[PDB]
Amino acid sequence: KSHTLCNRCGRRSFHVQKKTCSSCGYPAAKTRSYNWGAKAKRRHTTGTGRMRYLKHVSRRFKNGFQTGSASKA
Amino acid sequence: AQRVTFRRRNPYNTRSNKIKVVKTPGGILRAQHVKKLATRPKCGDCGSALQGISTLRPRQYATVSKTHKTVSRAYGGSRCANCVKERIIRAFLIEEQKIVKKVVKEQTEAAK
Amino acid sequence: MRIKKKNTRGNARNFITRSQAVRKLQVSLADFRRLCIFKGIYPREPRNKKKANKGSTAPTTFYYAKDIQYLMHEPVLAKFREHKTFARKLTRALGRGEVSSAKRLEENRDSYTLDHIIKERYPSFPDAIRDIDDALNMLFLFSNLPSTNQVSSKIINDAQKICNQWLAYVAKE
Amino acid sequence: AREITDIKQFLELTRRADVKTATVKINKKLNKAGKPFRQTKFKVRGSSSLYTLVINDAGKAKKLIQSLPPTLKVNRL
Amino acid sequence: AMKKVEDGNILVFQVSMKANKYQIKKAVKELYEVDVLKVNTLVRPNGTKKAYVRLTADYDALDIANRIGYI
RNA sequence: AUAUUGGCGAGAGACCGAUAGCGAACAAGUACAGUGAUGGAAAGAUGAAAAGAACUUUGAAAAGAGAGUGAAAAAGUACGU
RNA sequence: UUCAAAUGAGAACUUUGAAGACUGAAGUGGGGAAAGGUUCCACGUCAACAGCAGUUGGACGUGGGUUAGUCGAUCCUAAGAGAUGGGGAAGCUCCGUUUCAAAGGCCUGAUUUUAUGCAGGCCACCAUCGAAAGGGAAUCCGGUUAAGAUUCCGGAACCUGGAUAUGGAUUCUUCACGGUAACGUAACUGAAUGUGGAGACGUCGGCGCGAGCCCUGGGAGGAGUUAUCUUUUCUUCUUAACAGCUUAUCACCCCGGAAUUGGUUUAUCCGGAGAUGGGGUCUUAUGGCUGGAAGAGGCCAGCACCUUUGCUGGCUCCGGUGCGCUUGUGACGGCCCGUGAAAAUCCACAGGAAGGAAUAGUUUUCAUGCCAGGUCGUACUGAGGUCUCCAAGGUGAACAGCCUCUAGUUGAUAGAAUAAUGUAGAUAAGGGAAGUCGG
RNA sequence: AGGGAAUCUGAACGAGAUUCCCACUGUCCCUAUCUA
Ligand SMILES: [Zn+2]
Structure with a gap:
């Protein structure tokens, strides 16, 4: 077994000897993706995960990026 | 068995x-x-197991008194008594060769 | 635990050398001693002098760690820094040849006050009167002094004024 | 564990006030080759290590148990 | 756990993963008004942390178990 | 003005109708395979409503025979035809 | 494999008892590194799997289970890797590891003389990662569970760090003395700076000594066999960490001066650079006695029992031995121009800065006393197919086999027949390669 | 206390090779039986 669990993507592709992930390219800052690997792009794109913050941006924009609080009509 | x-x-x-x-x-x-x-402590000048020093683990010397880590002479806990003897003799005669060289030097200057 | 280093714990973080106090404050020795005079801070004697050092038997004076560590955040230190800035910015004006801007720098000058420094030193009034023993001995000496290039006339006149106020009250009540 | 072959030393240890209990151990042993006798063993849990007292005599034992402070809890065997 | 309460005078708690032995000794002494002799911890196979809290001879674990609710 | 196979949100079709239409109508980028990069499936429909078979009997039990529910078990989770 | 019994609806296969075998310490035994990830254990269970079966499980469902100041990681460095400074490269990023880097951490002082703005000196290599087999502070015994043990309990310990308290010392007051000497001691200050030791080191050979195993004599108990012979065969008879005294080869010191050459090893090296001899010193290897500790463990025996019901007495001793095996240690001798990792950590010496007295002088490497020690791993398995540790006996000239003790198995579909053929192994009248290309 | 003797090959050789002489055997004449 050459590979161990990654920290960034947790895919078990962190090559022990090279000290780099073959899937996401840890620890180089840019997440590893190629235009020839279109299927591989689909497996790790935005939307596959939680989108904890990025879900609600459209809601906040629709409202007009508004602050304060509602005033009880 | x-x-x-x-x-x-x-x-x-x-x-x-x-x-x-x-x-x-x-x-x-x-x-x-x-x-x-544990090993014997050794003569720094000689290369021989110096007498009267306790034989302990390196860390184990911290616990024991100074009378188990040193014999009473000058260069006591580090040399032989033979290697101390030899450097008492040596430092004496070297110090006296300095005197004789000053006597010869002062005589030659007076000759010139 | 791992084996702790010997001479870094008990008396080594309880006390600090003068050199270590000066360096920690990043303040001149004079100004360290000026603050030490104002705050009422003095060297203290440990039970072990060499455990208070890092092992060395050496001629050393030990301050209290939490005392210096408490001196670090203080308005008087900041005002000493401000006096240093003022000093160069005045000699900038004087050294160039402009006199009006230098005279203006005097007008826009505030100074350090020793007001809050007494509240933390003598919190009760009866405690301040326990110090006034040594306080009135300096002041009555400095009244009976010819003014030199060391000590200005304003200094002696203000000291004599306080002396006369003290004498007037004690003769009053 | 440390041997004290010293009588009053044991009695100094018993009155330390940091000592809760004591123990008196009785043994059956023989001298040289001839005759059986009775050995006592006065043991106190000291401050750091256990101190012990072999007394081959029976009369000195008889005196010592009597000489102990009465407030101290004494254990046979 | 109920056996270890009675014999060794040991309370067995499920402690959170972030907390160490000082924090367990402090927590029991605060909440339960009872001094602790020693704390031993182990990470459970499921991912949580077990803690064996032994109380000093002046305190009884059977009495305190009946005092909190579980027996 | 222009481009816009991505995102946010709508509206449509002489389009496909579960071997089609996206790989994925469904615990689908899932199960799994690979040291790894990657590769990557299969799998829709009871009935209007669970009313999903109370109870009896045979058997060690799964189940079987009765009985019942339903408009229909020639709809009984192995369920449309 | 078989016989019997129990469990269950059901038994060649589950379990218990009895018989027969097998592994034979180079185990089918007991542990570990790696690896697997709950396989460990219990109860429930047979839907699917364990190529027959199954009431069984390395299966399924539900619960239980891994406890540490001392065991590892953690710390240190190795071979190497790799930031920083710089320099490339359109760039993703590569070169480079001390380089033409301003790379920083300590001391001195009445406060620094045109008045309260900091002066002078000391040192010169380079972050960091990289070992669960290298270096490293310190824990053992007995007990305990369905499953955890150097971790839990009882007992008994030790190490490290830190405050401080007391006794002792530091001598007529200011850093102790004896011994010819090797050196000895309850202590007996020691800064900058300089140095030394341990850490810390190739491989083999014979020889000495110690511990464990093996063999054995006597004795104190139990089990066996016995018609016969046999004071018979088997089994128990134990002593941990740590602590106080004590025990030594080597080596060194004094006396002594040697050929008529002596001493001496298993192995022929040693001596006027001081032999033999006479006398002493040192290290605590490793042993002995003592404590722990017999109070524990073991072997018995007697007396009570629906019973979570154990108690009460003993004995637990005294020896010997080796071309033995295992292991530890000491002094030698070879084998090399092959001269024999590093660092963390600890100690020591030289040095002579500074400090030290009359209602507690200075100094605690002396004695006693106080407190504390975090995180993570810890279950089990580990068997043409990864690594590793422990290793009983007898007969026999023998590492040949054959038989067994300790411990662990009886798992691999079964049953019924038994002709020819096939593979393999034997034996054979008479003749003795006539067979076959070719014993 | 399996042979032996020559020769070809690199005087003994080396499980070198060949030939012959002596011994031996189911290779065969000619198969037969038993066990796994
Ligand atoms: Zn990754």
Whole structure:
């Protein structure tokens, strides 16, 4: 077994000897993706995960990026 | 005729992993891990086990009194008494060769 | 635990050398001693002098760690820094040849006050009167002094004024 | 564990006030090759290590148990 | 756990993963008004942390178990 | 003005109708395979409503025979035809 | 494999008892590194799997289970890797590891003389990662569970760090003395700076000594066999960490001066650079006695029992031995121009800065006393197919086999027949390669 | 206390090779039986 669990993507592709992930390219800052690997792009794109913050941006924009609080009509 | 296992996690026959088969008060044989043996402190000038100094683990010298780490002479806890003798003789005669060289130097200057 | 280093614990973090106090404050020795005079801070004697050091038998004076560590955040230190800035910015004006801007720098100058420094030193009034023993001895000496290039006349006149106020009250009540 | 072959030393240890209990151990042993006798063993849990007292005599034992502080809990065997 | 309460005078707690032995000794002494002799901890196979809290001889674990609710 | 196979949100079709239409109508980028990069499936429909078979009997039990529910078990989770 | 019994609806296969075998310490035994990840254990269970079966499980469902100041990681460095400074490269990033880097951490002082703005000196290599087999502070015994043990309990310990308290010392007051000497001691200050030791080190050979195993004599108990012979065969008879005294080869010191050459090893090296001899010193290897500790463990025996019901007495001793095996240690001798990892950590010496007295002088490497020690791993398995530790006996000239003790198995579909053929192994009248290309 | 003797090959050789002489055997004449 050459590979161990990654920290960034947790895919078990962190090559022990090279000290780099073959899937996401840890620890180089840019997440590893190629235009020839279109299927591989689909497996790790935005939307596959939680989108904890990025879900609600459209809601906040629709409202007009508004602050304060509602005033009880 | 009891057969005996290692007690610590190392399964290998290293320098640190020596075994003494000791009979316990439970009437059974069991292994005892042998502490790595202490060596004699040695003459820095000679290369010989200097007398009167305790033979302990390096860290174990911190616990014991100064009278177990030093003999009473000058260069006591570091040299031989033979190698101290030899440097008393040497430092004396070198110091006196300096005098004789000053006597010759002062005489030659007066000649010129 | 791992084996702790010997001479870094008990008396080594309880006390600090003068040099270590000066360096920690990043303040001149004079100004360290000026603050030490104002705050009422003095060297203290440990039970072990060499355990208070890092092992060495050496001629050393030990301050209290939490005392210096408490001096670090203080308005008087900040005002000493402000006096240093003022000093160079005045000699900038004087050294160039402009006099009006230098005279203006005097007008736009505030100074350090020793007001809050007494509240933390003598919190009760009866405690301040326990110090006034040594306080009135300096002040009555400095009244009876010819003014030199060391000590200005304004200093002696203000000291004599306080002396006369003290004498007037004690003769009053 | 440490041997004290010293009588009043044991009695100094018993009155330390940091000592809760004591123990008197009785043994059956023989001298040289001839005759059996009775050995006592006065043991106190000291401040750090256990101190012990072999008394081969029976009369000195008889005196010592009597000489102990009465407030101290004494254990036979 | 109920056996270890009675014999060894040991309370067995499920402690959170972030907390160490000082924090367990402090927590029991605060909440339960009872001094602790020693705390031993182990990480459970499921991912949580077990703690063996032994109380000093002046305190009884059977009495305190009946005092909190579980027996 | 222009581009816009991505995102946010709508509206449509002489389009496909579960071997089609996206790989994925469904615990689908899932199960799994690979040291790894990657590769990557199969799998829709009871009935209007669970009313999903109370109870009896045979058997060690799964189940079987009765009985019942339903408009229909020639709809009984192995369920449309 | 078989016989019997129990469990269950059901038994060649589950379990218990009895018989027969097998592994034979180079185990089918007991542990570990790696690896697997709950396989460990219990109860429930047979839907699917364990190529027959199954009431069984390395299966399924539900619960239980891994406890540490001393065991590892953690710390240190190795071979190497790799930031920083710089320099490339359109760039993703590569070169480079001390380089033409301003790389920083300590001391001195009445406060620094045109008045309260900091002066002078000391040192010169380079972050960091990289070992669960290298270096490393310190824990053992007995007990305990369905499953955890150097981790839990009882007992008894030790190490490290830190405050401080008391006794002792530091001598007529200011850093102790004896011994010819090797050196000895309850202590007996020691800064900058300089140095030394341990850490810390190739491999083999014979020889000495110690511990464990093996063999054995006597004795104190139990089990066996016995028509016969046998003071018979088997089994128990134990002593941990740590602590106080004590025990030594080597080596060194004094006396002594040697050929008529002596001493001496298993192995022929040693001596006027001081032999033999006479006398002493040192290290605590490793042993002995003592404590732990007999109070524990073991072997018995007697007396009570629906019963979570154990109690009460003993004995637990005294020896010997080796071309033995295992292991530890000491002094030698070879084998090399092959001269024999590093660092963390600890100690020591030289040095002579500074400090030290009359209602507690200075100094605690002396004695006693106080407190504390975090995180993570810890279950089990580990068997043409990864690594590793422990290793009983007898007969026999023998590492040939054959038989067994300790411990562990009886798992691999079964049953019924038994002709020819096939593979393999035997034996054979008479003749003795006539067979076949070719014993 | 399996042979032996020559020769070809690199005087003994080396499980070198060949030939012959002596011994031996189911290779065969000619198969037969038993066990796994
Ligand atoms: Zn990754």
